[PDB]
């Protein structure tokens, strides 16, 4: 469960993100291409070429689905509803690849807020990025 | 990841008693009932809307057979997994682009079909031989993946 | 979440299991010990081969508290509580085992069920085993 | 894993700059926070009742530099991390009776902390070669497990 202080970290930590999200997910779509190859087999249809406008994209659609679950904290399974039916009936993405994007979101998070991410603001946002992974799996049979 | 003597003898002791076509139908059926996101891979098989229209669709059956069949001919190569499906490796990654943790979903599917067909025959020192085996074959099957 | 079906089916499953539960929760720890060694870690106390008292005696427990998430299988992070809170803050096994000794139950069930482990009973008992296990994880962080 | 010999330089090349004390130490120390079921083998390491405290215990600081230590160690045989650590891993299973998930989930913190240190220097492609390290070596420590 997100406690309070988890949620008060997250929103802070993607407050500082703001309009770099895009940018931030398109890297870690990038980072977990590189190091964890097999997440490829997802996307035979895409431009995966250096630089990808078609992965730049793709990461502005999965940050704007993050930057929308940070608003709606509260009450992500709702927020995320129709995104869930798409991952549970069309996408069916294995679940263990949930946890690969959150850990190459959390180093691209790293990798750009020196200051705001501490040991406590870490664990809030794998809480959270573990959460959202739940509930966009939370249809699937 | 190896097995010893005496398991590698309970493996094939166990398979010789296996009817491969059938039980590789059950298993992919299973896969497909069990783990439903798996179904991504087969739109092309027709209706798989309930489980028995899973479980009795032929082309899931037949699909079964080949898919078991190749698993049952690794089974004369535990020594060297990794080169026996380095073909089929390449092709699941590069032509069916199949995420491999299906292999390992597979594998544990197989295990509960061998368990649900030979009840106390299947008995906990067999089943570690065939994690082994089912393990390694997953295995194998993803390292060519790039 | 666990379907109408579902409860239908895992009732009926574990209602033919009946007074061989703790019989079969010992055998599922067994399986586990023996094909997946790494989950003896937990257990440096317990003489873990065939026959072992201290294993029969668990595999008692852990029955018994499936049983009891049975009858409560609408309400289970209440039901089960006091062991969420005796895992999440004691035991602290990882997550990964959870799944390891929920296959091996599936195993054990399916060795003892021939007529009622159908391939849609195999999957209710999945998702229930998974719905348990996420209970029993629900206050790790 | 393999190692390509780019990435063995690439791999060389950063570690040269780490400082392992720190690191070691925020690594350990992180692991505790943000998966803190993971302090169930350090009772004895006194407080860590709070974020800062386990930051700031000095076991869990210098037990995290003595575990990067043997890391850094691991680091001259990429190509048999199974050999070097296989003393490590006979010791981890019978001695200290540690599930070797932890050492995927210490491998993935300490990813984590040299991106926090090293910023845009730790590129996709040299996160890339520090995965493939990680997973080797907590695939090496797990090797002996039984
Ligand atoms: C490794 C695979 C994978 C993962 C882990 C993943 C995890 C996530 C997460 C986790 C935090 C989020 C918020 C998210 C958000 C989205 N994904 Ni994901 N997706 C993944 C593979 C896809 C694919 C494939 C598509 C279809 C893209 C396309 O354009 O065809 C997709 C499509 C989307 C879309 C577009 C919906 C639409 O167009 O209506 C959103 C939004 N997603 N995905
Ligand atoms: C869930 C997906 C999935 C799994 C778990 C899986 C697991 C396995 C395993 C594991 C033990 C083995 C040995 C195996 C072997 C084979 N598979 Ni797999 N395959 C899978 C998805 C496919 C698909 C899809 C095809 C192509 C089917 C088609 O439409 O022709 C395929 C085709 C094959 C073929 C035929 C190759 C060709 O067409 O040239 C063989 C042989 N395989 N498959
Ligand atoms: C691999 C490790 C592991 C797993 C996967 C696991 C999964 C489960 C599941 C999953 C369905 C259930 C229902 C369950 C139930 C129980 N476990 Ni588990 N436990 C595990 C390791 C333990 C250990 C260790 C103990 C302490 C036993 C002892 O006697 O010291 C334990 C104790 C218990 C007890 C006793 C509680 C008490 O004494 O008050 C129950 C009940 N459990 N455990
Ligand atoms: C979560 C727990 C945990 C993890 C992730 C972990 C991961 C690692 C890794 C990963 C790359 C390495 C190289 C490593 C190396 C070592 N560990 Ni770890 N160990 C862990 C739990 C321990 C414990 C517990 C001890 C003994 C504690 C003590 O008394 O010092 C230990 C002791 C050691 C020692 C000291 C051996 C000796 O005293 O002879 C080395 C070296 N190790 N550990």
């Given at each position: 469960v997100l406690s309070p202080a988890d949620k008060t970290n997250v929103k802070a930590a993607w407050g500082k993100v703001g309009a770099h999200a895009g940018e931030y997910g398109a890297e870690a779509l990038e980072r977990m291409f590189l190091?964890?190859?097999?997440?490829?087999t997802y996307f035979?249809?895409?431009?995966?070429?250096?630089?990808s406008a078609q992965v730049k994209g793709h990461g502005k659609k999965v940050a704007d689905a993050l930057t929308n679950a940070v608003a709606h904290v509260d009450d992500m399974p709702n927020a995320l509803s129709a995104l869930s039916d798409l991952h549970a009936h069309?996408?069916?993405?294995?679940?263990?690849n949930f946890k690969l994007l959150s850990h190459c979101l959390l180093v691209t998070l790293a990798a750009h807020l020196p200051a705001e991410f501490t040991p406590a603001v870490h664990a809030s946002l794998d809480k959270f990025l573990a959460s959202v992974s739940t509930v966009l799996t939370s249809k699937y049979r | 990841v190896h097995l010893t003597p005496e398991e590698k003898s309970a493996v094939t002791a166990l398979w010789g008693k296996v009817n491969v076509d059938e039980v590789g139908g059950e298993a992919l059926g299973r896969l497909l009932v069990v783990?439903?996101?798996?179904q991504r891979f087969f739109?092309?098989?027709?209706?798989?809307?309930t489980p028995d229209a899973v479980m009795g669709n032929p082309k899931v059956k037949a699909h079964g057979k080949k898919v078991l069949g190749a698993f049952s001919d690794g089974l004369a190569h535990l020594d060297n997994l990794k080169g026996t499906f380095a073909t089929l490796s390449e092709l699941h990654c590069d032509?069916?682009?199949?995420?491999?943790?299906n292999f390992r979903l597979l594998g544990n599917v197989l295990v509960c079909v061998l368990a649900h067909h030979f009840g106390k025959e299947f008995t906990p020192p067999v089943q570690a031989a065939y994690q082994k085996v089912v393990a390694g074959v997953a295995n194998a099957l993803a390292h060519k993946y790039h």
């Open positions: 190091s964890f190859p097999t997440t490829k035979p249809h895409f431009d995966l070429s250096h630089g069309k996408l069916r993405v294995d679940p263990v | 783990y439903p996101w798996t739109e092309s098989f027709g209706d798989l809307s032509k069916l682009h199949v995420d491999p943790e």
